[PDB]
Curated annotation (Swiss-Prot), chains B, D:
Protein name: RANTES(4-68)
Location of this fragment in the whole protein: 27 to 91 of 91
Disulfide bond sites: 7-31, 8-47
Result for mutant: residue 20 to A: No effect on inhibition of activity by tick evasin-4
Sequence positions bearing Methionine sulfoxide: 64
Residues glycosylated per entry: 1-2
Amino acid sequence: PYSSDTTPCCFAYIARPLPRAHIKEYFYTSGKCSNPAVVFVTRKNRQVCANPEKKWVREYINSLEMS
Amino acid sequence: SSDTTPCCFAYIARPLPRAHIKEYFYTSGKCSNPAVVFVTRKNRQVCANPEKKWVREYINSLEMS
Amino acid sequence: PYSSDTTPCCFAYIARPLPRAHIKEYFYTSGKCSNPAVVFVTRKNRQVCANPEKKWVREYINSLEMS
Amino acid sequence: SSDTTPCCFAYIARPLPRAHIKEYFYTSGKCSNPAVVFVTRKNRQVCANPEKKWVREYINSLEMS
């Protein structure tokens, strides 16, 4: 059982770290997706796919739920 | 402005009302499951099984414009 | 090597699902912590510890990555 | 208004300046590593090794008020 509405997945990861100050939110893509992934939402409301195994990705996450 | 790709992991069980669908598109081949997405006037992206008769018929009607 | 500043960890998980509409952000606690955990930041800016293995927790995360 | 607990996973290598510390507290026993937290006037929470001489001395001075 699962939603029959589309679900976002990532098939590519941004190569280098996004500017930390341009990021306001994040969310992990569904476990249903083929690739694990972190999607950062920038302040201009863009959505960027990132690799959860990357050090900067984990640090950005730790920073985001301090705020 | 998004790097994500919409994929489908379930198909709607019953035929969606034809009257409220404004267009359709097929989910990316990158997605594991093949699927037709019917977009409703309220911008709902509903997943449907490409092999279903009603789905093929809806697509045909949307193709004739 | 690691930050010598304090790092937040969770030692208890909220028993039941928080109201989805009261949540604006989330972040996973450091892998350094003894327990894996998800910290939801409410709109009143409170921080609630949650279990990543819980179904509602994963769903809330998937939802937050969409907004 | 938070359910989290501050823990320490590293100790500051050199003695922090005494002049800018307003208080201290020990991290929870729930944390895996024992630690003293020196809070600076800029609200930085710095982790320090309880066994260090300077740490015990700083604590003593903060205890005499």
